[PDB]
């Protein structure tokens, strides 16, 4: 909500390392949030900017931050296939078994697109495979609807 956080939000989505590091030098808030509830971590995990997501959490950015609906940056990264960001936000203390207000884990978002490497990355770190959304749907049923075989055998 301050004039230093809005610039961080603007430069993280556009992918600028110089401006982001500078604005972080001046003590800008890396927990900044848009009118939707997004820190630059979410924007980087959404648009595929590493060398930035590696920078925001060193400066003290909240990894398990959530927006006005409960979507962490893992939800955004696990939904598009940013593996080099998934293996990062987890090394920095991200809740892999997280849940938005609806009730989906990042497995329910990675099994939809077919990002099997990320499925392995996540269940390596204790991702619940018997979890259910408010619909009563696991990752197995979601991999079956889409009719995949890899994600079908990964989950036994």
């Amino acid at each position: 909500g301050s004039d230093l956080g809005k610039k961080l939000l603007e430069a993280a989505r556009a992918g600028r390392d110089d401006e982001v590091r500078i604005l972080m030098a001046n003590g800008a808030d890396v927990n900044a949030a848009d009118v939707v509830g997004w820190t630059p971590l979410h924007l980087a995990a959404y648009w595929g900017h590493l060398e930035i997501v590696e920078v925001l959490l060193k400066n003290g950015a909240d990894v398990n931050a959530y927006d006005t609906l409960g979507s962490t940056p893992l939800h955004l990264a696990a939904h598009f296939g940013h593996l080099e960001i998934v293996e990062v936000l987890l090394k920095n203390g991200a809740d892999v078994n997280a849940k938005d207000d609806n009730g989906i884990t990042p497995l329910h978002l990675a099994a939809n697109r077919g990002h099997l490497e990320i499925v392995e990355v996540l269940l390596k770190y204790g991702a619940d495979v018997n979890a259910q959304d408010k619909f009563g749907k696991t990752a197995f049923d979601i991999s079956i609807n889409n009719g995949n075989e890899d994600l079908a055998e990964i989950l036994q």
Partner: protein, 1033 residues
Amino acid sequence: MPNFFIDRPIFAWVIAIIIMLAGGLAILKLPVAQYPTIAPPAVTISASYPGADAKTVQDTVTQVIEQNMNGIDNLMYMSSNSDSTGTVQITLTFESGTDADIAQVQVQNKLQLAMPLLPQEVQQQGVSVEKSSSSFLMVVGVINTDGTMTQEDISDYVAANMKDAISRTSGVGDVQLFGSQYAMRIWMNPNELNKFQLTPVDVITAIKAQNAQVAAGQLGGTPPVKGQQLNASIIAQTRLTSTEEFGKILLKVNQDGSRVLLRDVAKIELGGENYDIIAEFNGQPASGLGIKLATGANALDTAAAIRAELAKMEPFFPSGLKIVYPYDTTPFVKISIHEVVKTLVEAIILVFLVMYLFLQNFRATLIPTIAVPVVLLGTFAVLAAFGFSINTLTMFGMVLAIGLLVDDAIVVVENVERVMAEEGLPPKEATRKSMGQIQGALVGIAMVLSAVFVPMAFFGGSTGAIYRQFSITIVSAMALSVLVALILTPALCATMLKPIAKGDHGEGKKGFFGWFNRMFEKSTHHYTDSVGGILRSTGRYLVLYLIIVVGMAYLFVRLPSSFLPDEDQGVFMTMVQLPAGATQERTQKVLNEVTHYYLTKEKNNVESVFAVNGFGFAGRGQNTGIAFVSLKDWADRPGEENKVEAITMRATRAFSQIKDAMVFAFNLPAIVELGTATGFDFELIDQAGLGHEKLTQARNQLLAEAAKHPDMLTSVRPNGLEDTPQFKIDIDQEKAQALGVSINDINTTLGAAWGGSYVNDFIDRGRVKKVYVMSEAKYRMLPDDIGDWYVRAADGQMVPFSAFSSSRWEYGSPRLERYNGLPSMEILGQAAPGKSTGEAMELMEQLASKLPTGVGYDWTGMSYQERLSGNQAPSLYAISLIVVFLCLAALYESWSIPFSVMLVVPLGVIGALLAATFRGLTNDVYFQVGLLTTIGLSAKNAILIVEFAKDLMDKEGKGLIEATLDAVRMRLRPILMTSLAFILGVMPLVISTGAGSGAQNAVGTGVMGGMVTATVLAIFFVPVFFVVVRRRF
């Protein structure tokens, strides 16, 4: 021909009378506009699929029409823009020379067969094919001072009452509306619909069922029974007129007999159709309508008739209502067309009295005062015949010709006055002897100038429509000047002149006149000895020629090319663009700051401020906004600090401080519909089915790599919009049927509650208005209110949106633009202050060859006309030079001679190039036209020197040098008359600021500069060239 109109003078007169009356039938009929139709004809399909996004429109409305615009004639573009409000706008663009009506019907029809592909939700709203001129002749604003009204009431009182009234007016064309005529809206409270177990679907049903019109039939209708004595129509239940009646319709009944209505569930009101736009005239809640001109009418009289029609109904409409004019250009067009009339009538005065200074005879001065009006009136007649009009371009065309109009009269008058003085011959014999010297030179000059200006008319495409006005006008003017110099002027010389006998060289007696004749003779003898001294020495003054040519060519490159000067039309604009995800309240907080700045600090210049939230250029979104700033008359704004080129800078500087708002104030361009600031319209296209995101990556890459060459690329901007948050609901198809819920119920509920559904039509005061249904803002602003909407399953139990749906956010584009069917994104920019455009074009079509696989480029806008053009001017001027050389070899009967005349074109050019440099003037079209005029009349004042010298060396055999001396002596006087009259008539154009400043100056500076040089240099060089060429051959 001349010796014919000497013993037959009255004959000449009756021509000069006809081509005078023929002008009067054109001063009164010719339509007066600001600029003619130069833009490429174009049409704009428009369609608002309401309560939608940018992809829904792209996939259901835009791509469909974009596939079925097949077999259109003379098509260049298929530009398209789909917004998030729902409105798609498709802009075609046809060639130059195309009928707009035929193209418009071709489009209307190729769409009429594409209509039954669009949904049943656009066919209702309908599309609107209409020509694009973007040219508001004038805008009208309607206010309620009291404050009892709103935008949605003034809009209706304007539509139902006045739009009709000013539409029956003379030359009014199309009338656009700001605001929206009345419409009854039903705002629903889902907290009350659950209680009564209702939804916004059986409401749609009850409103479509209890307002429709039904056909019944007749009584005693044929075929009748024998013995019927009565026939009368039958009328069943019909439309609902008053809003109260809507509160009387039934939806259901409960077990206890309680009857359910609308009143107890929804809230019924009369408002507008679309609330997105919000107009304010100085903060006062206001609205208005906009008028654009009918093709082939007079704008001055049209505006003077509309300013009357609006008073004819002044007293009838309620008290508290006022009518103001935020944007008009006629107060500027009237000046722009008058500041030249007082220039032409000031030029005939100056050429009248200059001849009183040199000739010193009243009867000698009246002759051009008679010829020039004849020529102007015949020019107006010729324009009226070709369908042309009166514009700024056409009038400036005859302004920078007036010298060629007075030159063809004084050359005839001063030569007969020189003969009557050197030989004492009477006027008849003196004229019939002079025209025995000039009758052929004037025809050669006619051909020369025809070849000089004509090629300018075949040029590019949009500049063609400008050069063509100029060329047609000037060619008509010179064609009539030469005729009246072969028809009327010599007859006038044979009658009006008064006999003088030999030895009347002119000595003068007491006043300015004796001094002037004496000094003229003295300066003439000295100048003549000087030209002799020069003729003794060639090389010197033959190498200076190369110095001048080199300086000219080196100045022709430090001249920043342009198209037209921006001027003070009395109005400018401000543009507000806020961050994405911005509301209407913030934009209005910014526009009220704008208004306070313009009404508090600049009230000495600013008349009013017309702010429009939601009407931005390059976007109709809730984010942006515009403001039309109008200024006081030019007498109330004296000086240079009180112009628009300074208020623009003041306002830009002040609004740069506005936090979280990109504000930009700018002046109007000369040609509104056209592009400005010599930019380029580049655009990326995806020809491999790449996504929007990958093409956005390619664009960001190209921008990050174009800031690498700031030497020729300065501000390379994406004209489009960056992606912005959006709410993705995912309807679970399993849990929706597990409870027995129809999906066409879910989607309908959502769209009606949040987007508004055109349900039906109703009648009010004898006019059709619309019936919209929507939710009440309180219940549709945020998520987490979704759970308030309960839809009905077949089992009766009502289910919320929380059981079916999941929710998420995503960055999806608010605007999606196209080009020729394929997705694309536009990229603007401009060449550095010193570099040309072609360099910036080749650079970034070299930077575009390095983009990912499947991404191509294309040019649009003004940059497309330069691809199929550019190489027209050099070839056309080369063939013009050939034509001139041949027309002069015919006139002199020699292949070498002409070069002498053809070596004075760079003299009158360096003067203009020096003046426009000392004044900071660009290479406008006015500047090129002034260059051409100076070239033409310098060649004219040289052709006669050479013809005199040649005739003296063939008829009299005086010799080369002596004959050239006699010729420069004879012709000195008229050359100064022309130069002086032209300079004096044009000086007001170099000084006159205010109205028509950037154009008057752009013309007059170049003209004056070229004239000084082609007068004080051409008196000295052309004899050198003549002798040189005669010696070398």
